[PDB]
Design a protein around this ligand. Structure first.
Ligand SMILES: Nc1nc2c(ncn2[C@@H]2O[C@H](COP(=O)(O)OP(=O)(O)OP(=O)(O)O)[C@@H](O)[C@H]2O)c(=O)[nH]1
Ligand SMILES: Nc1nc2c(ncn2[C@@H]2O[C@H](COP(=O)(O)OP(=O)(O)OP(=O)(O)O)[C@@H](O)[C@H]2O)c(=O)[nH]1
Ligand SMILES: Nc1nc2c(ncn2[C@@H]2O[C@H](COP(=O)(O)OP(=O)(O)O)[C@@H](O)[C@H]2O)c(=O)[nH]1
Ligand SMILES: [Mg+2]
Ligand SMILES: [Mg+2]
Lengths: 428, 35, 45, 426, 161, 428
């Protein structure tokens, strides 16, 4: 009937979904052994009597984190065959993750894909969870998408890429990985959700006011923003939005599908005692530059199209009032080629929380999803980052020694340059 | 799911069923024909 | 996962009732006639 | 012989007719199990018009429901008065229409239209003949306006002379969900004009305005709005189900409203409407009610009637009242609003009386007025569409799925033509 | 179940209270040592936290039960005098029951039992009705948010109900 | 509906505002947390399950006055990041607080202003609070008025500035700060009134018979002035007076918008014993020059406009009788172009005492604010005090070092002499 297959590659992908599938089983009330003490069928298959098996696949080339999930808490709900261990890491190389050592894992992973999709009809989408900076996150991350566009060419490959910060990148050959995988990710994905490390670091400092986050605290927020995206899939709402609809109302040209997200409220228990979580203010609190997931200022950008879906007991009347409030605002200057720019998704399910995490509860959670012309700056800093390192061909002998010949570095320059100019010619 | 009575009656439109009704002495049908 | 027993934060209830055009206002002495009311009408000593 | 077959297209139609079958069930005295109740012989003597006998004393509605998603039609089945419909009346979709007029109409909708015309023709031909159809749908949604308009197009060549009477939810101007509005609204009106006999215009934000000011509520849900419009939608067809002093069926409303065969968009109103704090000090008489008719605060469409010269009008009262209190006051609207009713048509307005009122009412009415004031509605759908079209985006899917340039320009020129005769007959 | 016995709770003014006294109050256990330099830096902040939020209150909102890590009767009463709220006497069986129950001991591990972690001094464990850890206030943890983690107390959803 | 947002800058406005909200919380019957056991809507907002929060922001550049409140008894009253604090004190510098350190906090200070303004439509305006004695109240305070004026155009900005006392001002660089803090305060605030400290001092000796109180005992008297000023809009009255009425009935010309204040009676548990407090004699005790709380003596000046707010079991015929004896009172001289010069307002409640304070239970009280020609003398002596500083450039290197050049002081001299000339021509 209704199902979605989630794919995770890289260490960022495995631990992001380690928080996503924790939050999913927390929603349905199932004990994380697989036993429950019809709406869960989009994320879980039924195997026997009361046993729930996830629709996830775990992929990397380095086995120190797939075996950590295997020996970890979720040993029995996660059946031991969904996880795949590699031989050796791609080691921050697109060429290693795609050409040399990726061939021994892509054959097993695709044999999993068509034997997990042939179980029932009505396959709906894929949730690809990849890190663009990582070598196996972009290497095996790339290699899975053209092979997924060959067999399932008439389906949706939705993506979640953690773009690097301008200052925080935690790798030296990281901008080499980003430039050379985005062009090959471009015409093989159809929806791209770009997040950032330092952006959510700023969020955790400001409104959830921890001085001290870590990667798992990153993973609570991203698991929440994916769950709000999939809220109308699993459960019931007034205006339900499905996977085939996120692209219906955001991507005007096939080239422009890169896109930001945010979430509101992101608060603590002491931060919910004292203020409105009203509909008229959450939309305002999700539109400032201090709230999105990419630290990309849209004040010199131009908003283009946005889904604003809700979850909880919320009525579309004060939703409609909040929409007119945004349109009458002068600072959020929308484009002139569409006076209409909104979708208001809505769902009745109360916002779930993890007991233990600092994200306190509320009866209204709002994920802002937005396509904008502000992407020109976040890719332009990415372009001059490459041009300074490519001045005297730095770090290129690793890639050409792996078998990736000198010369397909170079069209990745003007392909991202052609993408960069696309933002100017749509905003004129 | 917020299954409380006031919310579920609100989604079920019972409020308009209450206040489109006329709350007075209403049903006037006398048979004027005499034998 | 059984730590779900919790009264919900951010306490608004969505006002389903009639909006309050008229809030209870203390009508007292200066906006209270009497006096000349029984002087114009002589309700007898 | 006088049969109406209901069609509820998409998530719009299924829930807007869920409230209609709710308010017509308890008006006809029917419990949610299906069998008959309601202590009045009026409602049984004409019960076939919306119902069929299920060989057990049980009445089942004559409704066929469109959707490509089983989510919201599973919810109406769980809800009350949802088990009234026989299970063979529903049709299941699995792919899902993506609020795309191309997706609903052409490519995967053709695999369900063969599976739903075969059930609506069995429902229609079970009687000797039928008076017409009613179809409920939106124009901002693709599962409601893809199968909605295409079912209208093929029933035209199937049944060439029986009326189609569609209640259309239009894109609201100020707020805008489902951002691809004009590719659906403009590309559905351009076949509604030549293949539908009656179209009734309902706006979402105008329903918002009339319940927040006039009906005076703070924040009800959407389900309270559906009860407002389905009450008037029941009062339109009161003569087909109940007797009256002045009989007027739906084709009587047809000939008396449409002067030229191509413009058939109507305004729909309901009266009396008032709040809980405003019930007991108000008067209930035909004088004050006909004055409550004729203002923007009652209109369910967000087109200002004061900017439009009224072409024709109609009012079907319900209850027990005198005819001269109807028509001297109905004339009194004409001579008081001298500039507001078009001069070359003398006596622009017509009345009709149902002898029964709706439950809990004494004198109710529905106002079907073919006013010309929808220049503002049709011209800003076309202003939004011409901002959408001079640039070629949100449209490469339509070209890739199988259309070309000429059919968008056909719909834009046709919708420019919708505006064109409105002011030059005004 | 009955977490504490009849004569275990012990507050200021030197009197015992039973277990039903904690009905409807946010209940927390203060694993702390008298001479520990963490506790010297943290106890004044618990004293002010206990001060303002329930004194400016409509009902009694907070009880803290000191449960001691000390070494002497005289050292126990000396730390007792600087502290008003509830507590547990050191040499009842109760201190070493909630010690292994809540994983709060002081690197004396192998000479007693062969388990792993200790999560020792200092700690406040706000708890539920059935002796369950309700949520951790991170003074000395992976967060190591000492002297400020008291603001992370979730007092509305943790009641001794 | 009716809304006002009390904004405070400088630490003088911090514990003036602390006395303001301890009087407002006590008056409305709400708790130090906020749960009380539409009427409260103008100052508190309904935020929580029977729980309310103040509509105020506390803006100071140094921590020791903000964080000690955040660790005090009212820590669950305020939304905890409405109490925004800087890193380093401006230290009696307009130049630092307006040009080089103000921008580090005003970007987030405005950011919280338009949460509170967006929460409801129907603001009357903002209750501005500052002292022009210091550097944060002058510098960061003045910068706040240009940005509030350009963002919000036609909203009232009703400022309570603690004007320095004439003969002493507990500072040395004081004449430099204020004469150019009132430079832009002329054209950016709307309804401003002088509050001299030493005038609050010597009314405490004469009336309250109190000889060694503290700043907070002044703040009890100031907070009663706050409450009596806006209780006509808060609670119902015979002649209600709004904030837009205070523009109407006070200011003759837009430049001359400075007034004075008086609050009578101010009696202790000795004088409330033996005195009757009718309206016919407390109005005389409010118009006397000794009860003036700015040390501006009206005897050598001409009264232009006068406003009065009454709280208690006042009958309007006693208002008419009291103002009739004032018109016949010959030393109280009113200007020849304003033959009718009175606004009056009626409220039903008596003033609410702080327990343990220096006020007594008084049935009826008066809050008087008057625009008078005589108030030019507090700027005439201030003009003279700046002249012998600026004669040979005292403390000029502190202010030229962080943002202004030599010439802004003389440019502040020009419109302050223009103020003196405007006051002289209207008082003819
Ligand atoms: N948003 C987010 N990003 C992460 C997280 N963990 C790692 N990353 C990003 O991943 C990038 C590098 O990839 P890694 O996750 O370290 O490793 P990988 O994806 O397995 O690829 P390899 O480096 O070849 O091992 C870094 O630049 C990080 O920004 C995470 O938990 N959340
Ligand atoms: N009315 C009143 N005035 C005060 C109070 N506290 C300080 N002042 C006055 O404020 C003047 C100096 O300004 P301060 O508030 O002390 O300092 P500031 O304006 O905040 O500037 P910074 O110290 O740099 O932060 C002094 O002349 C005092 O008379 C108070 O509580 N009430
Ligand atoms: N009937 C109905 N109309 C809606 C709803 N939400 C939005 N609308 C209005 O209808 C348009 C969207 O079409 P909709 O009926 O929701 O989509 P559909 O499910 O494909 O038919 C928008 O212009 C809205 O103004 C809804 O839940 N039901
Ligand atoms: Mg690994
Ligand atoms: Mg200071």
């Amino acid at each position: 009937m209704r199902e979605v297959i989630s794919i995770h590659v890289g260490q960022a992908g495995i631990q992001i979904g380690n928080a996503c599938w924790e939050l999913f089983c927390l929603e349905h009330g199932i004990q994380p052994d697989g036993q429950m003490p019809d709406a869960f069928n989009t994320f879980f298959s039924e195997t026997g009597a009361g046993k729930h098996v996830p629709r996830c696949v775990f992929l990397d080339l380095e086995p120190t984190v797939v075996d950590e999930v295997r020996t970890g808490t979720y040993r029995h709900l996660f059946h031991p065959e969904q996880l795949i261990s590699g031989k050796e890491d791609a080691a921050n190389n697109f060429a290693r993750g795609h050409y040399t050592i990726g061939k021994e894992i892509v054959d097993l992973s695709l044999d999993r894909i068509r034997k997990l999709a042939d179980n029932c009809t009505g396959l709906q989408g894929f949730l690809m969870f990849n890190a663009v900076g990582g070598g196996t996150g972009s290497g095996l991350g790339c290699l899975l998408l053209e092979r997924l566009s060959v067999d399932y060419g008439k389906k949706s490959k939705l993506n979640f890429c953690s773009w690097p910060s301008p200052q925080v990148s935690t790798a030296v050959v990281e901008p080499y990985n980003s430039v050379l995988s985005t062009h090959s990710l471009l015409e093989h994905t159809d929806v791209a959700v770009m997040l950032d490390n330092e952006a959510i670091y700023d969020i955790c400092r400001r409104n959830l006011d921890i001085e001290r986050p870590t990667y798992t605290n990153l993973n609570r927020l991203i698991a929440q923003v994916i769950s709000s995206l999939t809220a109308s899939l699993r459960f019931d709402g007034a205006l339900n939005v499905d996977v085939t609809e996120f692209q219906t109302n955001l991507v005007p040209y096939p080239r422009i599908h890169f896109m930001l997200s945010s979430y509101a409220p992101i608060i603590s228990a002491e931060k919910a005692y004292h203020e409105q979580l009203s509909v008229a203010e959450i939309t305002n609190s999700a539109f400032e530059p201090a709230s999105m997931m990419a630290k990309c200022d849209p004040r010199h950008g131009k908003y283009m199209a946005c889904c604003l879906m809700y979850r909880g007991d919320v009525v579309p009347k004060d939703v409609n009032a909040a929409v007119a409030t945004i349109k009458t605002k002068r600072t959020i200057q929308f484009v002139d080629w569409c006076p209409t720019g909104f979708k208001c998704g809505i769902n009745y399910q109360p916002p779930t929380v993890v007991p233990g995490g600092d994200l306190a509860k509320v009866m209204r959670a709002v994920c802002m999803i937005s396509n904008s012309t502000a992407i020109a700056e976040v890719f332009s800093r990415m372009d001059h980052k490459f041009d300074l390192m490519y001045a005297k061909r730095a770090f290129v002998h690793w890639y050409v020694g792996e078998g990736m010949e000198e010369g397909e570095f170079s069209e990745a320059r003007e392909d991202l340059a052609a993408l960069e100019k696309d933002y100017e010619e749509v905003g004129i | 799911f917020a299954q409380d009575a006031t919310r579920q009656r609100a989604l079920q439109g019972h409020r308009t069923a209450d206040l489109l009704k006329t709350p007075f002495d209403y049903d006037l049908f006398h048979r004027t024909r005499l034998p | 996962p059984s730590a779900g027993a919790s009264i919900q934060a951010a306490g608004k209830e969505i006002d389903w009732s009639e909006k309050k055009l008229f809030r209870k206002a203390v009508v007292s002495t200066v906006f209270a006639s009497d006096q000349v009311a029984e002087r114009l009408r002589q309700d007898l000593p | 012989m006088r049969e109406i077959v209901h069609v509820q297209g998409g998530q719009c139609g299924n829930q807007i007719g869920a409230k209609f079958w709710e308010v017509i069930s308890d008006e006809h005295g029917i419990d949610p199990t299906g069998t008959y109740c309601g202590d009045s012989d009026l409602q049984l003597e004409r019960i076939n018009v919306f119902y069929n006998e299920a060989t057990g004393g049980r009445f089942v509605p004559r409704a066929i429901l469109m959707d490509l998603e089983p989510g919201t039609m599973d919810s109406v089945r769980a809800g009350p008065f949802g088990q009234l419909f026989r299970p063979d009346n529903f049709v299941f979709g699995q792919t899902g229409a993506g609020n795309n007029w191309a997706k609903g109409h052409y490519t995967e909708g053709a695999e369900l239209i063969d599976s739903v015309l075969d059930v609506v023709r069995k429902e229609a031909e079970g009687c000797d003949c039928l008076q017409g159809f009613q179809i409920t749908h939106s124009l901002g949604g693709g599962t409601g306006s893809g199968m909605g308009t295409l079912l209208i197009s093929k029933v035209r060549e199937e049944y060439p002379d029986r009326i189609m009477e569609t209640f259309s939810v239009f894109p609201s101007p100020k707020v805008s969900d489902t951002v691809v509005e004009p590719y659906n609204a403009t590309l559905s009106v351009h076949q509604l004009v030549e293949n539908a006999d009656e179209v009734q215009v309902i706006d979402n934000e105008a329903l918002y305005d009339i319940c927040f000011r006039t009906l005076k509520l703070t924040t009800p849900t959407y389900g309270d709005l559906n009860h407002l419009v389905s009450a008037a939608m029941s009062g339109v067809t009161c003569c087909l189900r109940f007797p009256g002093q002045l009989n007027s069926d739906l084709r009587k409303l047809a000939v008396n409203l449409i002067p030229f065969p191509r413009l058939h968009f109507f305004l729909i109103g309901f009266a009396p409407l008032t709040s809980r704090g405003s019930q007991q000090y108000r008067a209930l008489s035909v004088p004050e009610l006909t004055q409550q008719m004729f203002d923007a605060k009652n209109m369910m469409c967000a087109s200002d009637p004061r900017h439009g010269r009224y072409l024709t009008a109609s009012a079907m009262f319900r209850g027990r009242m005198s005819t001269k209190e109807v028509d001297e006051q109905m004339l009194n609207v004409q001579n008081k609003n001298s500039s507001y009713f078009v001069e070359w048509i003398p006596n622009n307005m017509k009345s009709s009386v149902c002898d029964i009122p709706p439950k809990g009412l004494k004198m109710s009415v529905t106002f079907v007025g073919n006013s010309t004031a929808i220049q503002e509605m049709f011209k800003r759908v076309s202003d939004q569409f011409t901002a959408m079209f001079r640039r070629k985006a949100f449209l490469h899917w339509y070209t890739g799925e199988g259309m070309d340039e000429m059919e968008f320009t056909e719909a834009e020129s046709n919708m420019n033509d919708l505006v064109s005769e409105y002011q030059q007959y005004q | 179940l009955i977490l504490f016995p009849e004569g275990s709770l012990k507050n200021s003014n030197n009197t015992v209270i039973p277990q039903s006294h904690l009905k409807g109050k946010s209940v927390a256990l203060y694993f702390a040592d008298g001479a520990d330099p963490k506790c010297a830096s943290l106890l004044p902040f618990l004293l002010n936290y206990y001060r303002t939020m329930n004194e400016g209150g409509a009902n009694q909102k907070i009880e803290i039960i000191f449960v001691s890590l000390d070494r002497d009767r005289e050292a126990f009463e000396s730390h007792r005098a600087h502290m008003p709220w509830l507590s547990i006497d050191l040499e009842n069986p109760l201190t070493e029951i909630l010690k292994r129950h809540f994983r709060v001991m002081k690197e004396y591990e192998v000479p007693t039992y062969g388990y792993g972690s200790r999560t020792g001094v200092p700690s406040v464990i706000v708890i539920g009705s059935d002796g369950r850890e309700a949520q951790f206030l991170p003074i000395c943890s992976g967060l190591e948010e000492g002297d400020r983690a008291l603001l992370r107390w979730d007092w509305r959803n943790t009641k001794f109900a």
